[PDB]
Design a protein around this ligand. Structure first.
Ligand SMILES: [Cl-]
Ligand SMILES: [Cl-]
Ligand SMILES: [Mg+2]
Lengths: 4, 250, 222, 196, 241, 243, 204, 244, 231, 195, 4
């Protein structure tokens, strides 16, 4: 899962 | 202790009537008149703010309620029953629709959810039916403008225009004479104001009449700018002043 | 991510870069890290992308219902309390790191929320991988009594420090301005200082280049 | 953190640094670690920022509800509610809390609640990572029934030292004064306390 | 007629248990009244201690719900205290959940919803009480909101409740007719209390000693009740008038 | 009608007839009283001697709650025990969470709310007792009486049971004749007299007297039973007065 | 032991002038062993297209799930679900399984039938929406697809040009991944005709 | 306790009937008549609306005919609200079957589960039965075209032609008279409308007091299409058979 | 009459008729007697049979080494209540290493019975019990009625025609109360007490039931040839 | 367990399944039938974790037989395979998942086609001309890629299967004690007795 | 996580  | 009433309080009599639904409709009969009219570019819903004491501040008691930014409701019957239905209706628009699809429900489907809640009070154990009939006016992108009536049984019907409560029989007749499929929204407001005077006894002004519309998007009512695809709520409550402006040209 | 919040005279401003990463790869060059909780309460989110979006919508939903129930405009401290208590319950596993800001009947507010559920109050804040680059700028240029335009410049300057100096941040600057007595203005792609240069060549292929085995019309109808 | 609470002639004073840490990075240099759970019952928070906030919020809620039904709670009662939370959830909590309040009967009182959720009523209490460095100093310099100005100085000098040696303490020194006269917030900046 | 024992509809669409719960409202034979000042909201209620053996200080129908909200009950005391404990719990929870003090009108709505449930769900009886909530709301200013066993509630300019309520109501209507405003145009709560006592005296046609009354005042950031002495001070000033 | 066959039903006057019928069971029971005094409270009760065979002193009816509260009741004895058991749980949980022993007003509402709860549903029956209780807390002495409806107030003196009127009249005299206050040891004697006087209305069977008290000075704020020389002395003072 | 790369496979989507394209490979393997050459990863619900990469059991399960949900949607709403709406439904459904997720990389493509706008989106396994003008990529050769797309792509391609571009991005990415390939399908989607082409590619 | 107010909805009469089922059926007998007729090449559903007002929005309306899946529809006689509860259940049940077996649910299987739900309300739980009778019209590749009915008892049976609601006695006699096995759909359309025309309690049958649906193989080759008639389409079919 | 449908209903004079009807089953029960000195406590019970081919229903149940009871009325209800007592005595031993006070046994039974007199759906117990025991404060006799009322006595009796024995014991009090250190004399007095309640019948060898507990005697029950000594 | 194969030819599905049951260093049995008849025209072979295999197979068999009785009808192979897949797909996220892999061979009588489904313990379903579970596939898939033709007869299918078993007996480390072969066609399910 |  991608992060910011 | 706890609820040991797990059996139905609404049952069929030998003639086939469901007594409590009939009696709930009788409570709606007693209720103050409310109505809705569907124009080509909008819907109007209206009712009388019949105050309990003149010491009461009747702006604090809203009979016409926003459900979603494009859907509004009014009722006839028992006020407290209506209040909790609005609470439940607002929430179910989120839990069973907006939190799933990222958009507000279309009118018929929100109506469908309210109807479900009212049907359950007709069959579940240990409860009585709701003592109200609702009129729900709304707009959605793929259905346009619509008006629905919901009864204690959980039944709902789409209307061009109708009225409920006290002087509904008379008011429904009035609306048959005046309604056509070419009404512009302003004409529908005007007809609604005429229809409502028949059934109001005392004062007839913008402080005793509650009236809302589902019409054009209101960017000025949005609260923010910068998302050009968000254009604002189509639901708008007419002010005390706005109503009185339309009563001089009555 | 780089995100910031800066208070000023008559309100508060938040800003964010627009890069999403999956490891060293840039997953999204222009995602929106600024979220609307209510019309005049906005949220900037760093951390697990889905968590910041989901937690922001959930509390936004409940705030709307609460606003309707109370016949009042929502307050930032309600969003703050609801967010923090939710995040605390999840013991850090919901990886949302938020700067919450807005205006309400009480005034203008600026807060941060860490994923384990602690909150902070300040006139200037920064979160995300680029938070040190941004905070270096904020600590250098922030002053008491900023005008709206000074606050916007300071905020986007802080985001720029993140964009240039942090590999976790890039692309554009989004801004949202929440001033007292006015509508929130959401400035999507307020700055776009990373426009791809013109490519040297067009890679559009001669038609028929690709070898095909079969065709067929798909039935989308009823 | 560095925190402490000191009873004196007219009541009690709470004191704290303003540093929040995220590793060796200072996440907040102006934190308020002194927190109100009732008009004249406050606490100093150390350990996890999230845990101690969550705890203080619950305690404030309990005491608000206590107040509605039975009137003003005693400082002992407030400390008991903190204990119940800290003790029963000792596996999941990192919270070192000092509770301090002012009754009109009991004057100033200080209860310290270390990690395990035990309760200890003391004339004064120190806690937080920075407190280790001032056990010597504080034990040597504390007396009972100090004046307000003496107590402010004791706290200022003590936390000054804790901040000097502890890297996990710093920023401003905050204090909260609790007497019959009401509630007073004090703040002291580095340029003052550093060169003491 | 078992439609008379539980809260189901009668053939004429009525709820007899709700109607009879209203009749229990007057069981105590007390009248209450509430008015708004500029800065305050005042509620007064008759205090009747029949038995000489009672501790008169423990005899009260006014409740401090939160720091800012007060509530007076018309109805039997067991139901009154049941309602007060719930209101206190609801107001404290609201503050914890949402980070600000529960507004008077929202608490009124919440208690009204609870009452509505008792009118619809069979296993719960309605409470035989009418609840008058008062505060100086930070958004709305001086506020009076009242709840009944039907689950109805509304805001008031002023209000009264009890057996001789109609006398007091028309007395107040006649004043506001004349005054032309929403409230008691008075600076200090002391004089608004005096107004309240004065118009209660005229409408009921009776005199009061300090132990015949019970007064609650709501100002910005606190609601409080008066001692026998603060009331005596107030009765004295009305006499010298 | 039929309004009186089901608890929690309002009659058309607005009454809960089942609570009113529970009051009849209270009125049917033996006399019990409480007298508030300078720094404490005193409780007394008449125990009817059904037979020679009842072991004297050994059917105790006054009950302690926590360490500082006394409770006495008239009506259905088991209903009173049930109420005191709940009171003991309420006091334990208060002390557990808040450290301090439960204040008497706080304790009064715990019982009040619990009794009132038994008038909300048709699946429970109201309590068949009126309960007199009280003690000493940080704010002084408090005496309370609590009825089947859940209604309770603070009292200077209180009585219930068959001799309630006789006893009430007797209490009213003391309140008038001792307006500056009554001492703990005075109240103990008065309590004995009043139970003997109120025994007039129950006089087929002769009775056994039982007294208890909390006094800041005489018992250190703790609830203790009155026995031995102090009990006999108060019996004698009562015997004097009915002759 | 990494569920997202046991079976292998890829999905790519692109926008063009009044059209969208979505393509996938056909491989289904168990680590090194290729098992099936016919395992398509693109499905449709009315005019909305969904491609799913990742663990094949979840790919199958999610297709069955979204068919279910869109069928009920249609019955109640009396219209076909639109891509913007379906995208939201996908997001909700994945995030609902936040702490026990489906190990998938879904991709949505289609044209809104009211507004005529081409629409594509991609998601992570827990529901995060990635909306894009240009292209979305997914699967075990996603690095390669990102490289191919970022260099080959240009805006406003005609359907027959877009076809070549998306096909070349897929093919050449697949050929640098051991777990992708073994055939490929390309859907070209215009406002109301949809062509499906099977590509000839290396079978190793 | 609460036993005092329990109607005992799930007991037998001394004759061995279920009071509430009987009384529910009595309720249904005053509902708008609905008719199903099954042909060799399709099925007709026709139903009369409960007496209209001129102001009712008739085109965006549905009171009688509901879609269950793509191959199955129902006609309702009774409480609409009760029917919707059951309809959503049936719709979900259809989808569970499809999800499980990757095949559309056989008509009887759907009908049985709905009828089993109704049955339950007559034997346990102390709740009132659903005041609804359904006519099910659907197709599957085992039995082809099928008509069923279910009523509050949860009993179901299959039919070539059937009516529910008001005047089923007169309607059933008329269907029995004119129905014949080799019938086409278009003949069944006519029979349905002519039967309502004669049994109606209204003065004359108009488009605005009707709902109408067909289930034909009349799409393209070996597959099935549901057509829920628009008002204008009913107005035409009413002229086409000379009732107006 | 209209108020005897269940235990949760008071009559207009404040009575509980279901509790009173429960009390009535005790009155139909065979007579049993309790009495005690300072060193021992004795139960005597007249056992009743169905006919001449049947056994004589046991009326005495051991609860612990130092406690036990006799029953009059519904026997299964005595089984439930005696079993509860066994548990409560047991719990006192395992947890506190403490023999349960007969007085506490009394209070525990009262509270158990009471719950069934205030809640819908339940019913009062239909049995009366006489509990004897020897504990840290000596010999005890208790009388339990299913109204929840428990009473400590020197002696008593319950069941049909128990008024004969209860009168006898009332006169005899000063004698039997001081039969210390003599088991057989206390029993004799008990057997005589019960005889004042006999009509058209007298005590046979498989009709009489006696139990004793005291200073150095565990609660034990005597039946059959073991009671012939006393006829 | 270990070896299960399946080949679908023109008019039938053939399943071959090893006979050995081994625990530790002992072959406990050499005549084990690793199969259950689900319906008269549907057969399922299985391999995996000890105990789980038979428990799962019999449980599916019980469910399919119940359906048959209830509807007086035989579920299609596609329908049975989808039911089985769903059961395994549920199982994989249970507290203790079924570790069982299956081949489902059936003759669809409505279509008059044989069908072979390969489903692993995760609920991964695929329809194939030929299938295998475990290490068997590492030899047979390539062999079958070479020698298999879509229109083969049942006899050609069995010869093709002999090739597979021969290769496995040459190159597999373990003695799997031969295979039991079963044919599913329009006339139902039968067992070849000399292989 | 933020410590104090
Ligand atoms: Cl903090
Ligand atoms: Cl509510
Ligand atoms: Mg290869």
């Amino acid at each position: 899962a991608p992060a910011x | 202790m706890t609820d040991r009433y797990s059996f139905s309080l609404t049952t069929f009599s030998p003639s086939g009537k469901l007594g409590q639904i009939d009696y709930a409709l009788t409570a709606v009969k007693q209720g103050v008149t409310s109505l809705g009219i569907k124009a080509t570019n909008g819907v109007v819903i209206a009712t009388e703010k019949k105050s309990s004491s003149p010491l009461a501040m009747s702006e604090t008691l809203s009979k016409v309620s926003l459900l979603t930014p494009d859907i509004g409701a009014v009722y006839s019957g028992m006020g407290p029953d209506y209040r909790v239905l609005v609470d439940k209706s607002r929430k179910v628009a989120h839990t069973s629709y907006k939190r799933i699809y990222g958009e507000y429900p279309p009118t018929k489907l929100l109506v469908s959810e309210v109807a479900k809640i009212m049907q359950e009070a007709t069959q579940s154990g240990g409860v009585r039916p709701f003592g109200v009939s609702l009129l729900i006016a709304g707009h959605d992108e793929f259905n346009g403008f619509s008006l629905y009536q919901v009864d204690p049984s959980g039944s709902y019907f789409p209307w061009k225009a109708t009225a409920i409560g006290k002087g509904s029989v008379a008011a429904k007749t009035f609306l048959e004479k005046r309604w056509n499929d070419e009404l512009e929204l302003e004409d529908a407001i005007h007809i609604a104001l005429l229809t409502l005077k028949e059934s109001v006894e005392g004062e007839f002004n913008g402080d005793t009449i509650e009236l809302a519309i589902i019409g054009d998007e209101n960017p000025d009512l949005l609260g923010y700018t910068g998302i050009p695809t968000d254009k604002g709520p189509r639901f708008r409550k007419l002010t005390s002043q706005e109503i009185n402006d339309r009563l001089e040209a009555l | 991510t780089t995100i910031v919040g800066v208070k000023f005279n008559n309100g508060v401003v938040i800003a964010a870069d627009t890069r999403s990463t999956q490891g060293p790869i840039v997953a999204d060059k222009n995602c929106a890290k600024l979220h609307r909780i209510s019309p005049k309460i906005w949220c900037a989110g760093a951390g697990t992308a889905a968590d910041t979006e989901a937690v922001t919508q959930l509390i936004g939903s409940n705030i709307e219902l609460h606003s309707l129930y109370t016949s009042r405009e929502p307050r930032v401290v309600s969003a703050l309390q609801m967010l923090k208590q939710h995040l605390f319950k999840y013991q850090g596993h919901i990886g949302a790191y938020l700067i919450v800001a807005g205006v309400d009947p009480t005034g203008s507010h600026l807060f941060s929320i860490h994923a384990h559920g602690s909150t902070d109050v300040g006139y200037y804040l920064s979160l995300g991988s680029g938070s040190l680059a941004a905070m270096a700028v904020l600590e250098s240029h922030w002053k008491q009594d900023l005008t709206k335009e000074e606050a916007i410049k300071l905020a986007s300057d802080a985001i720029q420090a993140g964009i240039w100096n942090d590999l976790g941040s890039g692309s554009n600057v989004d801004v949202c301005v929440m001033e007292i007595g006015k509508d929130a203005e959401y400035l999507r792609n307020y700055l776009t200082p990373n426009v791809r240069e013109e490519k040297q060549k067009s890679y559009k292929f001669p038609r028929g280049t690709t070898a095909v085995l079969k065709e067929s019309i798909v039935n989308i109808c009823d | 953190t560095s925190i402490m609470a000191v009873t004196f002639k007219d009541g009690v004073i709470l004191g704290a640094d303003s540093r929040t840490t995220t590793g060796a990075y200072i996440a907040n240099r102006v934190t308020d670690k002194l927190t109100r759970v009732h008009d004249k019952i406050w606490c100093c928070r150390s350990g996890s920022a999230a845990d101690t906030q969550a705890i203080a919020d619950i305690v404030q809620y309990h005491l608000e509800l206590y107040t509605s039904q039975y009137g003003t709670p005693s400082t002992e009662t407030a400390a008991s509610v903190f204990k119940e939370l800290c003790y029963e959830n000792k596996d999941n909590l990192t919270a070192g809390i000092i509770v301090a309040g002012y009754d009109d009967k009991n004057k100033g009182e200080v209860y310290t609640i270390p990690l395990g959720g035990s309760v200890h009523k003391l004339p004064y209490a120190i806690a937080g990572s920075g407190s280790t460095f001032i056990y010597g100093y504080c034990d040597k310099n504390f007396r009972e029934n100090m004046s307000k100005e003496e107590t402010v100085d004791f706290i200022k000098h003590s936390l000054s030292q804790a901040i000097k040696w502890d890297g996990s303490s710093g920023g401003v020194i905050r204090m909260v004064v609790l007497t019959a006269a009401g509630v007073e917030r004090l703040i002291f900046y580095p340029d003052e306390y550093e060169q003491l | 007629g078992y439609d008379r024992h539980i809260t189901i509809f009668s053939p004429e669409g009525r709820l007899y248990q709700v109607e009879y719960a209203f009749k229990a409202t007057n069981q105590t034979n007390i009248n209450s009244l509430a008015v708004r000042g500029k800065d305050c909201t005042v509620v007064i209620s008759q205090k009747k201690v029949p038995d000489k053996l009672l501790d008169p200080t423990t005899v009260s129908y006014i409740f401090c719900i939160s720091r800012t909200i007060g509530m007076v009950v018309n109805g039997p005391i067991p139901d009154a205290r049941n309602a007060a404990l719930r209101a206190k719990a609801e107001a404290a929870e609201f503050r914890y959940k949402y980070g600000y003090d529960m507004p008077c009108d929202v608490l009124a709505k919440r208690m009204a919803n609870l009452s509505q449930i008792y009118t619809q769900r069979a296993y719960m009886r309605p409470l035989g009480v009418i609840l008058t909530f008062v505060s100086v709301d930070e958004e709305l200013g001086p506020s009076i909101y009242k709840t009944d066993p039907a689950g109805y509630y509304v805001g008031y300019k002023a209000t009264a409740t009890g057996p001789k309520q109609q006398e007091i109501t028309t007395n107040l209507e006649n004043h506001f007719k004349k005054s032309k405003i929403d409230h008691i145009n008075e600076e200090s709560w002391e004089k608004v209390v005096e107004f309240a006592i004065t118009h209660m005296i005229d409408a009921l046609g009776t005199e009061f000693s300090k132990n015949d009354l019970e007064v609650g005042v709501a100002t910005k950031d606190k609601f409080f009740t008066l001692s026998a002495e603060n009331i005596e001070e107030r009765l004295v000033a009305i006499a010298e008038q | 009608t039929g309004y009186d066959l089901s608890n929690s039903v309002f009659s058309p006057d607005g009454r809960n007839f089942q609570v009113e019928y529970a009051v009849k069971a209270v009125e049917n029971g033996t006399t019990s009283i409480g007298i508030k005094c300078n720094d404490g409270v005193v409780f007394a009760v008449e125990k009817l001697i059904t037979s020679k065979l009842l072991v004297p002193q050994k059917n105790v009816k006054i009950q302690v709650v926590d360490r500082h509260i006394g409770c006495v009741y008239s009506g259905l004895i088991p209903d009173g025990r049930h109420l005191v058991n709940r009171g003991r749980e309420e006091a334990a949980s208060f002390k557990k969470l808040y450290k301090t022993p439960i204040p008497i007003p706080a304790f009064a509402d715990r019982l009040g709310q619990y009794v009132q709860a038994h008038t909300l549903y048709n699946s429970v029956r109201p309590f068949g007792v009126s309960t007199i209780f009280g003690g000493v807390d940080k704010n002084g002495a408090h005496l309370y009486m609590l009825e089947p409806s859940g209604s309770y107030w603070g009292y200077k003196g209180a009585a219930t049971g068959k001799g309630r009127q006789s006893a009430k009249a007797e209490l009213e005299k003391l309140v008038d004749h001792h307006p500056e206050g009554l001492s703990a040891r005075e109240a103990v004697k008065q309590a004995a007299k009043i139970i003997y006087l109120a025994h007039e209305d129950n006089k087929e069977k002769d009775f056994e007297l039982e007294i208890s008290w909390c006094s800041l000075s005489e018992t250190n704020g703790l609830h203790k039973f009155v026995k031995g020389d102090l009990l006999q002395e108060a019996i004698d003072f009562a015997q004097k007065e009915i002759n | 032991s990494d569920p997202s790369s046991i079976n292998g496979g890829i999905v790519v989507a692109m926008t063009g002038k009044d059209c969208v394209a979505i393509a996938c490979d056909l491989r289904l393997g168990s680590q090194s062993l290729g098992v099936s050459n016919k395992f398509e990863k693109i499905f449709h619900y009315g005019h909305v297209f969904l491609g799913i990469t990742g663990l094949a059991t979840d790919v199958t399960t999610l297709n069955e799930m979204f068919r279910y949900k869109t069928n009920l949607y249609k019955l109640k709403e009396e219209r076909a679900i639109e891509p913007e709406t379906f995208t939201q439904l996908v997001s909700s459904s994945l995030y609902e399984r936040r702490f026990g997720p489906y190990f998938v990389g879904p991709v949505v493509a289609g044209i809104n039938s009211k507004s005529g706008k081409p629409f594509i989106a991609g998601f992570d396994l827990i529901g995060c929406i990635d909306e894009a003008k240009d292209f979305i990529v997914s699967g075990t050769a996603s690095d390669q697809l990102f490289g191919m797309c970022e260099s080959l792509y240009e805006p406003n391609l005609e359907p027959e040009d877009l076809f070549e571009t998306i096909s070349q991005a897929l093919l050449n990415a697949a050929d640098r991944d051991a777990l992708s390939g073994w055939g490929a399908v390309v859907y070209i989607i215009k406002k109301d005709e949809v062509v499906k082409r099977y590509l000839k590619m290396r079978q190793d | 306790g609460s036993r005092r107010y329990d109607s005992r909805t799930t007991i037998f009469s001394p004759e061995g009937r279920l009071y509430q089922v009987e009384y529910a059926l009595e309720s249904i007998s005053h509902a708008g008549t609905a008719i199903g007729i099954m042909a060799s090449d399709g099925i007709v559903l026709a139903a009369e609306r409960k007496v209209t007002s001129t102001l009712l929005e008739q085109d965006t309306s549905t009171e009688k005919l509901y879609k269950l899946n793509d191959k199955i529809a129902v006609a309702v006689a009774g409480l609409t609200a009760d029917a919707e509860i059951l309809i959503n259940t049936a719709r979900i049940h259809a989808q569970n079957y499809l999800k499980t077996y990757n095949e559309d649910i056989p008509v009887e299987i759907l009908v049985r589960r709905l009828s089993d739900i109704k049955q339950g309300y007559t034997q346990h739980g102390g709740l009132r039965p659903f005041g609804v009778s359904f006519i099910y019209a659907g197709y599957d590749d085992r039995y082809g075209y099928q008509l069923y009915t279910s009523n509050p008892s949860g009993n179901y049976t299959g039919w070539k032609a059937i009516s529910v609601g008001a005047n089923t006695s007169a309607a059933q006699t008329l269907l029995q008279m004119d129905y014949k096995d080799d019938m086409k759909v278009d003949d069944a359309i006519e029979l349905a409308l002519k039967t309502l025309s004669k049994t109606t309690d209204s003065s004359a049958l108009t488009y605005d007091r009707l709902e109408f649906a067909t289930i034909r193989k009349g799409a393209n080759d070996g597959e099935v299409y549901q057509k829920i008639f628009k008002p204008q389409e009913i107005k035409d079919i009413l002229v086409k058979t000379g009732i107006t | 009459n209209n108020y005897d449908g269940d235990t949760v209903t008071f009559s207009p004079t404040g009575r509980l008729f279901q509790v009173e009807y429960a009390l009535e089953a005790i009155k139909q029960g065979s007579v049993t007697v309790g009495l005690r000195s300072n060193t021992h406590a004795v139960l005597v019970a007249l056992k009743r049979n169905a006919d001449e081919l049947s056994s004589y229903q046991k009326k005495i149940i051991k609860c612990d080494e130092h406690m036990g009871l006799s029953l009059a009325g519904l026997a299964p209800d005595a089984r439930v209540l005696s079993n509860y007592l066994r548990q409560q005595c047991n719990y006192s031993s395992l947890v506190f290493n403490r023999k349960l006070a007969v007085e506490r046994a009394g209070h525990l039974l009262c509270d158990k019975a009471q719950k069934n007199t205030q809640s819908y759906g339940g019913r009062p117990y239909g049995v009366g019990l006489l509990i004897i025991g020897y504990d840290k404060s000596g010999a005890h006799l208790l009388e339990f009625q299913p109204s929840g009322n428990v009473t400590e006595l020197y002696g008593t009796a319950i069941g049909a025609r128990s008024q004969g024995a209860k009168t006898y014991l009332e006169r005899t009090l000063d004698t039997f109360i001081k039969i210390d250190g003599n088991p057989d004399e206390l029993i004799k007095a008990g057997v005589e007490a019960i005889s004042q309640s006999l009509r058209d019948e007298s005590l046979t060898v498989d009709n009489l039931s006696i139990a004793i507990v005291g200073k150095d005697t565990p609660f034990t029950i005597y039946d059959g040839e073991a009671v012939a000594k006393y006829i | 367990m270990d070896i299960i194969l399946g080949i679908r030819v023109q008019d039938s599905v053939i399943l071959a399944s090893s006979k050995a049951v081994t625990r530790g260093i002992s072959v406990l049995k050499d005549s084990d039938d690793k199969t259950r008849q689900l319906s008269p025209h549907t057969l399922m072979s299985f391999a995996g974790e000890a105990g789980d295999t038979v428990q799962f197979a019999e449980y599916i068999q019980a469910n399919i037989q119940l359906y048959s009785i209830r509807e007086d009808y035989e579920l299609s192979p596609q329908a049975v395979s989808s039911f089985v897949r769903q059961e395994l797909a549920k199982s994989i996220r249970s507290r203790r998942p079924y570790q069982v892999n299956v081949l489902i061979g059936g003759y669809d009588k409505k279509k008059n086609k044989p069908e072979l489904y390969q489903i692993d313990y995760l609920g991964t379903k695929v329809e194939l001309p030929y299938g295998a579970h475990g290490y068997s596939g590492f030899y047979t898939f390539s062999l079958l890629d070479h020698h298999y033709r879509p229109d083969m007869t049942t006899e050609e299918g069995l010869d093709l299967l002999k090739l597979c078993v021969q290769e496995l007996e040459k190159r597999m480390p373990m003695d799997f004690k031969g295979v039991i072969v079963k044919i599913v066609d329009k006339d139902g399910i039968r067992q070849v007795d000399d292989f």
